[PDB]
Amino acid sequence: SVVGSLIFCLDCGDLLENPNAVLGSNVECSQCKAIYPKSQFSNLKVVTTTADDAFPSSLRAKKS
Amino acid sequence: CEFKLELAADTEKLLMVNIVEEICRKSIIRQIPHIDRCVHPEPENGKRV
Amino acid sequence: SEIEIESVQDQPSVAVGSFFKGFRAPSDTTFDLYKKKEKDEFVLHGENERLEYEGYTDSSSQASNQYVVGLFNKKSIQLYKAPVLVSKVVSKSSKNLRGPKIKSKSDT
Amino acid sequence: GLLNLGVKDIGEKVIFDGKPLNISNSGYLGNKLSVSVEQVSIAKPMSNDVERKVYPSESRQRLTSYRGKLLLKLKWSVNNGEENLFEVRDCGGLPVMLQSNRCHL
Amino acid sequence: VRKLLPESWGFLCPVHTPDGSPCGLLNHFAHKCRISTQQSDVSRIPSILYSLGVAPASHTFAAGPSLCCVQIDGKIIGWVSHEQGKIIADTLRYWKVEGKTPGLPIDLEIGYVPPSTRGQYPGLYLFGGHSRMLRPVRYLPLDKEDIVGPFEQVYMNIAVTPQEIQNNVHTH
Amino acid sequence: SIPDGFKKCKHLKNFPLNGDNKQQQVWLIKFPSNVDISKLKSLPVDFESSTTMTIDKHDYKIMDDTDNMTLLVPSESKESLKIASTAPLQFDKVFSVSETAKIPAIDYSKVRVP
Amino acid sequence: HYGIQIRSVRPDQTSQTNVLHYLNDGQVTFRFSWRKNEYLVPVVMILKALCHTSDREIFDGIIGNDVKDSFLTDRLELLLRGFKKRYPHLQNRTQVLQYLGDKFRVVFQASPDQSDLEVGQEVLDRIVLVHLGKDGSQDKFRMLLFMIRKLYSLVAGECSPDNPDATQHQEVLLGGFLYGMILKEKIDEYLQNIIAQVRMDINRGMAINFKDKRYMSRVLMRVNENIGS
Amino acid sequence: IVMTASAAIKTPQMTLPIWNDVSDEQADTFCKSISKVLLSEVIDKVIVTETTGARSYVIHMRFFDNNEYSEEYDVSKEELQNVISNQFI
Numbered sequence: 036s037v038v039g040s041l042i043f044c045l046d047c048g049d050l051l052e053n054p055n056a057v058l059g060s061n062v063e064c065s066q067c068k069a070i071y072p073k074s075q076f077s078n079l080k081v082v083t084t085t086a087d088d089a090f091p092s093s094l095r096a097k098k099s
Numbered sequence: 100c101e102f103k104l105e106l107a108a109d110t111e112k113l114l115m116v117n118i119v120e121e122i123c124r125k126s127i128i129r130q131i132p133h134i135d136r137c138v139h140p141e142p143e144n145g146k147r148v
Numbered sequence: 149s150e151i152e153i154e155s156v157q158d159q160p161s162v163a164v165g166s167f168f169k170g171f172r173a174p175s176d177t178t179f180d181l182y183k184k185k186e187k188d189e190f191v192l193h194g195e196n197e198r199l200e201y202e203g204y205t206d207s208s209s210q211a212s213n214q215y216v217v218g219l220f221n222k223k224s225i226q227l228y229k230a231p232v233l234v235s236k237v238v239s240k241s242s243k244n245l246r247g248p249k250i251k252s253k254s255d256t
Numbered sequence: 257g258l259l260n261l262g263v264k265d266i267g268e269k270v271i272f273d274g275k276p277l278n279i280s281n282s283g284y285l286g287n288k289l290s291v292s293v294e295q296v297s298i299a300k301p302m303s304n305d306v307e308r309k310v311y312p313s314e315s316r317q318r319l320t321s322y323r324g325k326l327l328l329k330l331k332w333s334v335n336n337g338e339e340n341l342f343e344v345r346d347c348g349g350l351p352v353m354l355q356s357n358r359c360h361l
Numbered sequence: 362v363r364k365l366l367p368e369s370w371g372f373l374c375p376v377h378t379p380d381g382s383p384c385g386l387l388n389h390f391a392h393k394c395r396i397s398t399q400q401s402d403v404s405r406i407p408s409i410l411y412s413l414g415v416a417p418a419s420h421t422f423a424a425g426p427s428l429c430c431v432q433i434d435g436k437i438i439g440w441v442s443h444e445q446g447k448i449i450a451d452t453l454r455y456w457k458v459e460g461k462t463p464g465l466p467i468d469l470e471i472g473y474v475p476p477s478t479r480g481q482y483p484g485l486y487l488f489g490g491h492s493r494m495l496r497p498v499r500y501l502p503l504d505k506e507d508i509v510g511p512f513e514q515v516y517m518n519i520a521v522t523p524q525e526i527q528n529n530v531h532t533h
Numbered sequence: 534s535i536p537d538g539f540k541k542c543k544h545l546k547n548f549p550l551n552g553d554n555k556q557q558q559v560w561l562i563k564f565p566s567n568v569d570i571s572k573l574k575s576l577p578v579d580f581e582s583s584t585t586m587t588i589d590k591h592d593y594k595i596m597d598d599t600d601n602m603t604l605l606v607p608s609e610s611k612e613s614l615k616i617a618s619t620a621p622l623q624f625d626k627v628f629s630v631s632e633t634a635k636i637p638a639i640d641y642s643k644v645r646v647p
Numbered sequence: 648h649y650g651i652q653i654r655s656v657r658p659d660q661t662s663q664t665n666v667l668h669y670l671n672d673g674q675v676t677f678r679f680s681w682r683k684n685e686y687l688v689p690v691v692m693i694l695k696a697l698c699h700t701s702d703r704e705i706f707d708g709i710i711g712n713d714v715k716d717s718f719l720t721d722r723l724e725l726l727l728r729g730f731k732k733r734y735p736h737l738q739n740r741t742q743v744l745q746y747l748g749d750k751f752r753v754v755f756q757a758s759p760d761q762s763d764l765e766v767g768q769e770v771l772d773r774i775v776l777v778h779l780g781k782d783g784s785q786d787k788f789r790m791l792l793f794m795i796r797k798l799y800s801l802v803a804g805e806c807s808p809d810n811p812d813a814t815q816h817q818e819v820l821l822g823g824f825l826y827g828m829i830l831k832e833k834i835d836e837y838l839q840n841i842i843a844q845v846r847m848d849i850n851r852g853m854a855i856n857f858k859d860k861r862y863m864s865r866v867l868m869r870v871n872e873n874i875g876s
Numbered sequence: 877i878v879m880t881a882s883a884a885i886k887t888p889q890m891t892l893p894i895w896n897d898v899s900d901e902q903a904d905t906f907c908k909s910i911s912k913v914l915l916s917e918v919i920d921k922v923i924v925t926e927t928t929g930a931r932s933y934v935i936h937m938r939f940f941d942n943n944e945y946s947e948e949y950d951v952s953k954e955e956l957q958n959v960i961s962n963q964f965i
């Protein structure tokens with residue numbers, strides 16, 4: 036299973052580490068020999084946002 | 100604006116929203132020495148200041 | 149509109165699995181239930197070679213806040229009493245206990 | 257009350273000795289013994305030379321303290337509590353304020 | 362901290378304080394403010410609370426300001442939305458001064474918090490133990506003596522004499 | 534296999550489930566135990582918060598909740614459960630049945646004394 | 648500058664302090680208190696120490712039906728990576744406790760016959776959120792889970808600072824309850840002074856066994872009994 | 877002033893007398909060449925990512941409309957072009 040930018044599994048019920056800091060195409064659980072990823076990892080797409088909150092001006096006082 | 104970086108596989112996720120924010124409030128569009136904002140006050144006693 | 153309770157019973161013979169969002173259910177080993185009888189609680193076990201199903205019921209409010217489950221097309225529902233169940237699956241991670249201390253010297 | 261229930265949760269404390277028994281010839285170093293406190297209660301004050309009743313205003317007639325007196329139960333254990341060499345010892349005193357539970361008012 | 366604060370409506374003196382160095386430090390209590398000395402020794406504060414419309418403890422996994430986490434004093438088994446928050450904010454205030462409560466004591470501290478302002482954290486808070494601080498007040502539906510502490514004084518308000526009472530902007 | 538649950542399950546029964554993909558699907562609800570599973574055998578089919586039922590306490594409140602849990606099917610006896618799946622097994626609309634313990638209504642007559 | 652705290656209280660009213668601290672790196676650390684000695688620590692090693700949660704239930708406690716917030720996943724997966732850095736062979740609560748036996752053997756003054764599993768649960772349940780009660784295995788995640796969603800929500804701005812300087816957040820030390828606190832403390836220094844008289848004999852030597860009961864009465868009264876004094 | 881060995885100060889200040897002829901309406905325009913404008917004064921939102929190719933990172937800024945920083949702080953592309961491959965990078 037996958038949430039955010041990271042992959043969990045089904046047998047072991049949990050995650051694994053950074054898939055590129057360890058071997059790509061060759062990953063499993065961090066504690067049990069429960070190799071659920073079959074090297075079809077993820078599409079790593081996260082999108083964050085700074086919400087323009089501590090950018091003071093005289094022209095953000097007008098939008099307020 | 101738009102610009103895309105690349106980075107090696109070893110270094111982890113970082114503060115990508117804070118890797119920009121603290122840079123912006125220190126970055127400057129024109130430097131001007133030791134001086135911040137100019138106020139236009141009330142005239143007083145025969146002199147505009 | 150309105151609808152009627154068809155079938156009440158005596159023993160509830162179902163539970164839930166409250167694992168987490170998205171346990172995609174391998175169903176590679178279907179496990180058993182260990183009863184109770186307090187009233188209306190259950191508990192479970194289930195074996196793999198490296199993995200054990202450990203699940204009991206919350207004694208704070210289990211039969212005192214009793215779900216049921218319904219079924220309809222006919223379009224008339226029937227009750228079916230539902231014991232909820234909390235679960236935390238375990239795996240083979242034993243055997244650390246052989247040498248916990250500094251037993252080699254241990255005179256410190 | 258509280259401090260009865262206070263020193264309730266205490267487990268099995270220890271202090272050990274240097275007297276052996278007979279691999280683990282140096283493992284089981286000696287008497288696994290314990291110490292615990294089960295009961296403590298100031299009751300009331302008194303004064304004598306049986307017992308009599310003291311007045312609280314009398315205790316500051318005398319330019320002194322309002323000296324109570326305090327008991328303390330000691331529960332003994334050794335080797336999972338197989339002989340409980342029990343004892344009860346006081347601890348001197350404990351002053352109480354006026355109109356309390358454990359005063360005369 | 363040396364200045365008087367207007368969250369202190371009716372717990373300590375606005376008027377008694379010495380003049381000089383302990384100004385704003387030491388200032389005694391009010392007239393009829395009281396201190397609880399032992400708990401709501403019932404353990405059925407939650408035992409009716411899941412009945413009254415609250416989901417159980419470890420079966421849903423919701424958290425955050427999007428829900429109002431029902432803090433029993435210490436324990437939690439409850440989180441709700443505000444649409445069950447304002448109900449159980451003062452449904453208790455219907456039960457609390459009502460004699461059909463063998464489990465809900467007269468002395469109990471229920472403060473509500475809505476998710477307005479993005480200010481305080483959203484919850485449904487219960488207290489009442491040792492060192493709990495009191496003051497009694499007149500709850501207007503079924504006018505009866507009722508105690509509150511300072512944690513009620515944020516999001517549920519008091520009128521000062523029944524002429525400034527007006528439509529659904531006071532309750533006490 | 535530690536505790537003392539006093540029993541091991543043998544007595545099992547059947548679930549009504551068609552497996553037709555109009556469509557018999559499961560329907561779980563939430564309500565306490567001090568309820569009418571012994572004394573009122575009927576409850577509506579309503580929308581978001583659209584009832585107040587009638588017993589001696591004279592309030593039950595069907596709620597909705599959409600915005601989970603794996604479901605187990607003890608089909609025959611010796612299995613004691615399974616995990617229900619058409620191909621997990623999802624679900625449409627859960628209820629949480631409270632009791633509208635109301636407030637005494639609008640009164641500003643006696644309490645507003647001149 | 649961030650931090651949310653608990654002044655957790657024992658059911659005999661002698662408290663402690665359990666703050667958090669917001670490491671600007673992207674981890675988060677505790678703080679305790681002791682004799683005059685602060686003991687900070689990372690959080691997952693005594694998050695995932697209570698009962699067997701090594702799965703999504705670590706993550707699924709943080710909000711489950713709102714994953715869509717983007718302050719979450721880029722900030723919870725740097726503290727969780729701030730622990731797999733330390734020991735990747737650490738997965739069940741037998742093994743997670745075992746680190747306490749390197750440090751917490753001689754800091755809470757334990758026995759030398761006690762293995763760490765007897766003391767690590769013991770050093771846990773003396774110092775952090777005692778008011779959820781002993782045997783709080785289910786009931787120390789679900790506090791601390793909720794306790795850390797606040798601190799992330801206190802840096803992301805959807806919360807606000809509290810006012811400890813007001814009657815908003817005021818209690819009373821009753822004076823008699825405080826007087827009933829010292830008689831939890833000075834009872835457990837009188838008890839901590841008969842176990843400072845036995846070993847000052849047996850390591851001086853010539854200290855016979857207690858089984859003859861006058862060894863008690865030669866050790867139980869040589870210590871001064873001055874709780875009242 | 878008297879005791880603290882006055883130095884780099886909290887409120888720096890000096891008074892600039894303007895001429896007899898310079899206007900109300902031209903002086904303040906050249907007061908906006910004086911005012912130290914930060915770089916963050918021109919952004920609606922900063923949406924940033926962490927993708928993966930081999931780790932990939934695209935920053936996709938959003939600015940205002942042109943006629944505000946050109947208006948309110950009297951500066952435009954004359955240094956916003958050469959702040960964005962020269963200073964911020």
Ligand SMILES: [Zn+2]
Binds near residue numbers: 047048064065070
């Ligand atoms: Zn695995």
